[PDB]
Symmetry: C5
């Protein structure tokens, strides 16, 4: 794709992208199944509803080319406003949660969290890395194929497109920094038992998606792809069991028309 | 729709206010606190009492009347804001659990939320529930007729923050798909031992102009301020826990703007 | 009011903390904390209550008037390394261990103004009975636990206004600059920086600094570093002095 | 490793990409990326750590295209490293709390990886220059490791004898060596150490972050003998087994380095 | 006397943590606590001290003086704390050794004369041991600000860190920077890079001027407490590297 000048035209698209934490029954939307532990890497068979997955959505756009002429037009993503939706819901310390102590309130959601988004002109490109190459992953998941011990560090065979919602477990996959030429991604992982969730909301924060040459992701087939993972931490039930809790992510993307050489 | 800043005599004004927190106020002596937290064992039977639920604060500030070809509107340019009474938490001598024998009282700490908005209309809110089956009490305005989807994103839960001491903080967030004519800022920090960290200074200003140099435009010459400042949990002698909240100060500088 | 800059001077001051000073050996400490079970009966002893520090620095009487204008301040908390003494009087972290560090709730605050600091009263417990020698909100109500606009005071006496009762008032102080950070919690680590390379500019948007009314400069502070835990598990506030170096210039104003 | 000629000519850019594997010990064929369980001796006088328990610095030398047709010219061309994009690969694999880990409490999830960590990279036109410093100069280091020679008690602070090139992968223990700030004129290095048994790992990924490698004079590392040197250490923290034993977990580091052709005096 | 306007000096300054025997260079003696302020007699080897070195500069001699323009500085050997296999308390049964952690202080100064210090004490009644220089004739005011307690950092391994701070009312001809982090479980956080430079020029563009052709470097790098198998605690410190760029300035 030879990139020419901006047309001077604009549009905004938006999306609330639901989280995919596992959803173990019809009432526990936004949560995973309780975490179970197998004593040994040798026999690790997690249930599907226990595994948070990456979220993704394809936003279709109208074709711009009256004829395909020497030059074509593509939608170009310029900026994104994004935020995690429902952060104040973790102030519900009155239902279902283990008491911090006798006569005390419920335990807050806390622990390992991951907050990730991407905007691209094509599906997010992912690289597989496993904690345990011998994990047996369940039907409905898409995980690294024919993993080896090298899969626990870096095995260049584990390449995937984030091409299915609620299928790619967050624990098996990361955005691939060796690809994603036509997407921008941003993530923070914070690990530990007692990590406090720290979440910010503001409508004043804009991420610019333009690269060094002033070019944003280009919607090559007239579609825009948004991707997310927002594991906020672990909910501790009265019983002591733990479940992931996730929140939806809002996207507002400003697009403009870009001329490219046919 | 937005034309030139109008300068001249009386083309600038400044308004200020203190917005009290709405933490629940469980009796006539415990203004600024919630009722003690109680925990029900299951999502199926979650019935919080009204006085246990901190709510969003909000007020409408009138501005000098402007005439309704271009409309004139007040444009909010800057805000100075801070939480009032942060040093009150250095009272460790009254009603608080002893950190240990011979020790002082337990500081306020734990989950906190600090939030403010300045807009030309009421703040627009999106509903999200920890537990869609929560039974909320009379006197609250909470997401109407919630479903399992209401635990993640249900687009039916749209509201204006149009009543003080009514919209529980746990049910509602600012809606990033709306608020075209407002600026909002919030930080949630969760966890049992989270330390409150609060800054005061009369030298810090937030600029409310967007990328085009336009601030919120005040419809019907009204400015809307919103806040929630849950500082954390106060731990009584017996180990019961209550929310503590503090008031928020606003000083807002405005200018006249030609429109449409 | 304010015309052109006319004529330089520097003043410096070390302002001692007022942590309660429970006896003549424990200067810089409060009396041990005691807890009363209920808000209905809360009568803190004077020596248990840290208070705001303040000094008035007189300046040459220059009298269209001329006024001293505060332009910059360099400020530093003095003695932060004294907290590395874990061999004197502190609870052992465990058997065979060293002493427990100073830690917990802290407040670091200073102000420079051309008049006394304007303060707003807010109370944890309106029914608190404060001791003789303290100045605290008069006629408090339940509304004094949030915002009660009656509670307005000038910081006009050293070692009298308890830190727990008063904050700088953001609705006043047009003629002062203030800065504070409160960090609350049982195990909060003190974090303190020193450098002689940091200057705070005191000029407002129009390039005007605080103007010294009646040729006086006012410095204010509170530096509660945390709690010292003694051998038996008692807790006391520890505070440190604050240094100020203020550059002033002469400013013309309208008569 | 991929070496891609993005542009040819005087304004030639070469992009070098590579994934550098961590060297945490690899105690068995199934625990690639982990150390051997930590064991503690009572005393400094009897400290003999096992080889597979000691994480080592990762390093590779990447050969670049020859630039000089005529070796006899008054001026020669060198590859100059101008930018690097880097990140740690597989950070989400720490969300597996279901495999082999101590429960946080009865009926709870697995304990996350946490504790002391070190995240470090370097890009240079020669091997990284290292200075030795030991916790305990009387440590007896195992065969297969390269550690400070004839250390003294002064080796626990600064002993200027302990100079080394990071010239072998999986051999220089992270605990014995740091980058030498008195040398490395032709390399850029960046590291953060965070110590404590409850330290949470905090790791960021983005394809938008670039580090500029030019010094004050606008000059990047110059690749001597057409050689680019990448080095890393990414100890994420400790994994706690069901038994309560603790092992280091490491992750691979990606590098994307942009290089230009600089004329230098022969 | 400063009128108008190159060399690089470098130093590895060793830490002075106490060094309780020939094998524990870089550590302090185990901590002991006395129950009361009235009876506080710490042993010399238990007390970390400020490090300092006088660095001779080429003689130049209306007069010319070396002016310090920039410093690069780094704490040396931070990865040594990844030894959790040697002499440390186990964090739980079968677990690894306890990391170095707790109270820390990281400080450096570059000056054209010795660092000027102000005394402040946790406990004015402490009796300090022979070989230390501590506040003379301390009073209860020594717990806050007592202007009697002025000293020059004029001796390596003599001025205990717990007794002295840099004096912000002096040091007109030096630049200093320190951070104190207090508490039992504070994690050490230490950064290395050869890309970071501190400019030493004041707002007028003048760096420290080297009197008697001498440059003074000062440090304190208490990393935290090492907890041995028995539960005893000792300070651990690391060396600090300095690389200082100097230029010639005409004075009178
Ligand atoms: Cl695969
Ligand atoms: Cl609704
Ligand atoms: Cl009053
Ligand atoms: Cl060696
Ligand atoms: Cl003295």
């Amino acid at each position: 794709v030879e990139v020419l000048e901006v047309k001077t035209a604009i549009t905004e698209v938006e999306c609330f992208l639901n989280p995919e934490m596992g959803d173990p029954d019809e009432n526990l939307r936004g949560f995973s199944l309780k975490l179970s532990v197998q004593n040994d890497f040798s026999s690790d068979s997690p249930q599907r509803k226990m595994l948070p997955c990456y979220s993704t959505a394809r936003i279709p756009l109208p074709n711009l080319n009256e004829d395909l002429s020497g030059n074509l037009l593509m939608w170009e993503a310029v900026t994104v406003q994004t935020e995690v939706i429902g952060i104040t819901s973790m102030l519900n310390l009155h239902a279902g949660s283990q008491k911090v102590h006798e006569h005390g309130g419920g335990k807050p959601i806390q622990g390992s969290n991951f907050h990730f988004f991407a905007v691209g002109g094509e599906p997010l490109e992912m690289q597989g890395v496993l904690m345990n190459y011998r994990s047996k992953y369940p039907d409905g998941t898409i995980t690294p194929k024919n993993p080896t011990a090298q899969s626990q560090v870096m095995n260049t065979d584990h390449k995937a497109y984030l091409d299915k919602n609620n299928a790619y477990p967050v624990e098996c996959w990361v955005p691939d920094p060796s690809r994603n030429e036509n997407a921008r991604y941003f993530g923070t992982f914070t690990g530990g038992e007692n990590v406090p969730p720290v979440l910010h909301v503001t409508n004043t924060a804009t991420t610019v998606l333009l690269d060094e040459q002033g070019v944003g992701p280009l919607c090559k087939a007239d579609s825009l792809y948004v991707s997310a993972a927002d594991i906020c931490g672990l909910f501790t039930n009265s019983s002591g069991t733990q479940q992931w809790r996730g929140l939806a992510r809002y996207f507002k993307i400003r697009l403009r028309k870009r001329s490219v050489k046919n």
